[PDB]
Every structure is written in structure tokens, then in C-alpha cells.
Amino acid sequence: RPTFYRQELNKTIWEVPERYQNLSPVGSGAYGSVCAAFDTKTGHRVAVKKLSRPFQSIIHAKRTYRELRLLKHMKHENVIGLLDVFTPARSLEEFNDVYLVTHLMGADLNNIVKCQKLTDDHVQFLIYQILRGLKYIHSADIIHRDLKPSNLAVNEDCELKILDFGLARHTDDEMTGYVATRWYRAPEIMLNWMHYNQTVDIWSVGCIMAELLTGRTLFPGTDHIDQLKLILRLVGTPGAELLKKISSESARNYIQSLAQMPKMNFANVFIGANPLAVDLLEKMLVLDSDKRITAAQALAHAYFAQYHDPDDEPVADPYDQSFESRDLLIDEWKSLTYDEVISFVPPP
Numbered sequence: 001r002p003t004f005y006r007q008e009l010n011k012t013i014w015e016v017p018e019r020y021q022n023l024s025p026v027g028s029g030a031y032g033s034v035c036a037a038f039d040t041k042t043g044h045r046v047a048v049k050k051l052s053r054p055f056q057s058i059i060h061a062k063r064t065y066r067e068l069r070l071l072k073h074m075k076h077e078n079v080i081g082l083l084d085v086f087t088p089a090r091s092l093e094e095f096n097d098v099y100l101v102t103h104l105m106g107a108d109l110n111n112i113v114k115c116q117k118l119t120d121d122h123v124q125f126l127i128y129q130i131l132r133g134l135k136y137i138h139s140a141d142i143i144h145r146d147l148k149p150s151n152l153a154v155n156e157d158c159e160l161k162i163l164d165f166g167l168a169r170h171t172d173d174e175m176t177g178y179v180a181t182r183w184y185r186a187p188e189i190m191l192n193w194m195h196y197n198q199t200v201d202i203w204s205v206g207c208i209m210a211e212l213l214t215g216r217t218l219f220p221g222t223d224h225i226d227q228l229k230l231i232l233r234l235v236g237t238p239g240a241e242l243l244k245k246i247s248s249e250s251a252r253n254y255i256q257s258l259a260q261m262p263k264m265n266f267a268n269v270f271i272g273a274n275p276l277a278v279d280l281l282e283k284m285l286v287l288d289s290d291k292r293i294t295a296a297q298a299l300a301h302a303y304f305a306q307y308h309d310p311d312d313e314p315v316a317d318p319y320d321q322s323f324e325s326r327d328l329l330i331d332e333w334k335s336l337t338y339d340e341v342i343s344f345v346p347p348p
């Protein structure tokens with residue numbers, strides 16, 4: 001067991017191993033507080049996140065266990081990994097606090113979209129890396145659920161990592177009105193007309209790719225209905241083949257009210273873009289999710305010819321998510337979390 005030291009930073013007690021020095025607050029949501037630190041064991045600048053109220057309810061205790069399981073599993077160059085996890089508790093009986101340690105990220109994709117002149121080569125390399133990471137995530141039967149520019153870390157060498165997996169955290173208030181939190185969601189998820197599946201992440205990749213090519217949000221809706229109208233004007237209203245599949249009475253009802261529109265010509269929307277970029281966007285931005293390109297299929301598209309290496313696009317170890325359908329008490333979720341903290345082995 002390492003030695004721990006205590007300090008107060010912005011009205012919060014931080015108790016951390018001596019290896020972590022020069023702690024400085026960086027931000028805080030309702031999920032926890034975050035400090036930047038220097039890790040003397042590894043030489044890395046790190047983010048230390050102290051969870052807030054990790055075991056306050058059954059829903060909160062399960063969410064804590066879900067986040068720790070997911071971060072312990074992810075071992076890939078284009079996905080955030082777990083450097084360390086610790087608790088100052090010496091036993092299950094005094095266990096209350098959980099701290100998570102990752103590499104400190106600087107710029108997100110939001111920063112480089114607003115500010116930099118992107119070549120076609122930049123767009124190829126950035127979207128290649130998102131798809132390489134997503135092939136890995138989807139091979140474990142994990143859905144990200146919240147891909148958007150602020151959840152993509154990028155360095156000076158244009159190297160990218162996926163972060164901030166959806167933990168089923170977002171509220172109705174957070175999705176309301178003119179908000180980036182909704183602009184990258186697939187239309188069938190927008191109003192819960194279908195259950196989440198991994199094809200929803202490819203829709204988000206299409207919205208990010210369009211925004212790197214134009215410098216502008218693809219579907220900046222002022223509310224759910226305005227955003228659906230922007231989507232259907234580009235990709236067309238449902239055809240007979242898709243209508244047949246639509247199980248939700250709610251959806252077919254509102255959709256039959258709208259005048260029919262054809263799919264637009266994407267070469268006239270994305271003026272001057274590489275024709276191979278236009279072709280790949282037509283394969284991602286398909287209303288019928290069964291017909292979208294997969295991450296594994298997209299990596300072999302001629303747009304990525306310069307970067308594609310089928311011997312260096314790895315898949316994940318199997319991931320057991322059976323806990324998701326399990327009914328447990330707060331203290332049982334807390335005991336499972338404690339076992340995962342004490343069994344952690346750091347990376348090489």
C-alpha cells in the first residue's frame with residue numbers, strides 16, 4: 001500500500017498517493033471533480049478524477065461499477081485507457097471514495113475544427129483513427145452512445161483518442177433546444193423510436209466528418225423536430241422498405257404527416273470535397289440503420305488507402321456485460337467495485 005497525503009482544493013478533501021504531485025483543479029461536473037497532476041512514477045502529466053457520491057443510490061453505485069469495468073477493459077491506441085485507480089480505504093468497511101487516473105488531454109476536435117485550415121489529408125487521418133478505435137470498441141459489443149467533437153482528444157501530431165463513453169448519464173434538460181449534446185445523435189434515437197445499437201455511432205462519425213470538411217455543424221437543430229426536418233431534407237423521408245420495419249406507432253404517426261422528400265445530391269452539398277469523401281458520407285448517413293456501413297467495412301474504403309493496414313487494426317478481448325441485467329443492493333455493487341479497485345494491474 002502506498003503512503004497517502006491530504007489537501008483541500010476548492011472546498012474538496014483530496015487524499016492521494018505521494019507519487020501524484022502539484023495537484024491543480026481543472027473542472028467539475030455532477031459526476032466528480034478533476035485535478036491535473038504530475039505522476040512521479042511514470043513521468044506523465046495526468047488527470048485525477050475524484051468521483052462525487054459514488055454509492056449514494058442503487059443507480060449511482062451501478063454507474064460507478066459500469067464506468068470502472070469499461071475503463072479497465074479499454075486497451076487501444078485510439079481509446080482512453082486507465083493509468084491507475086485508488087482508494088485511501090484500508091478495508092471494504094471504511095470504503096467510500098474512488099479516484100480514476102488517465103493521461104491529461106489538451107485540445108479536443110472542437111478546438112481544431114474552429115481554428116485550423118484542414119487539408120483532405122488531415123480529414124483522412126482523423127476519421128481513420130476514430131474508425132480504428134470504433135472497430136475495437138464495437139468488437140467488444142460496447143456502444144459509445146455520445147461521439148461528438150468534445151469527446152475526441154487530438155495532439156500537435158494530429159493523433160486522436162476517443163473518450164467520455166456514454167454511461168447512460170444525459171438528462172432530458174441536457175438534450176433540449178439549440179445544443180451540441182443532440183446535434184450528432186441518429187434520428188431514430190432522438191425521440192427513443194428504437195433501442196440503442198452500435199450503428200448509432202457510425203451516424204455520429206458521418207456528422208463529425210461533414211463538419212471537418214465544411215467547418216460547419218451538419219444538423220444544428222433548434223429542437224428535436226427542427227433537427228429531424230434538417231436530417232430528412234438531406235437524406236430523404238423513409239422509403240416503403242424502411243416504413244415496413246418501423247415498429248414504433250409514435251414514429252409512423254408523425255412521419256406520415258410530413259410531405260415526401262428525395263435524398264439530395266451530396267456532391268452539390270459538399271462542394272469541392274474529394275469524391276471518395278462524398279461516397280463514404282453517403283454510406284454512413286443512411287436513415288435505415290441496418291444499411292449503414294460498419295467501422296470494419298469503412299476501414300477498407302478507398303478514402304483511407306494511404307493509412308489502412310489490416311494487420312494493425314486490432315479487435316478487443318471479450319467483454320462480459322451480464323452485470324447490466326442483474327438486480328443487486330447498494331452494498332453488493334459497492335463490494336464488486338472494491339474488488340475491481342484492488343485487482344487493478346497497471347499497464348507496462
Ligand SMILES: NNC(=O)c1ccc(-c2ccc(Cl)cc2)o1
Nearest residue numbers: 187188193194245246247251287
Ligand atoms: N431497422 N430500423 C428500425 O427498426 C427503425 C425503427 C425506427 C426507425 C427510424 C429511422 C428514421 C426515422 Cl426518421 C424514424 C424511424 O428505424
Ligand SMILES: [Cl-]
Nearest residue numbers: 002017018019
Ligand atoms: Cl506513492
Ligand SMILES: [Cl-]
Nearest residue numbers: 079080081103
Ligand atoms: Cl490512454
Ligand SMILES: [Cl-]
Nearest residue numbers: 089095096097
Ligand atoms: Cl475511502
Ligand SMILES: [Cl-]
Nearest residue numbers: 148149150180
Ligand atoms: Cl461537441
Ligand SMILES: [Cl-]
Nearest residue numbers: 318319320321
Ligand atoms: Cl470481461
Ligand SMILES: [Mg+2]
Nearest residue numbers: 150151163164
Ligand atoms: Mg465530454
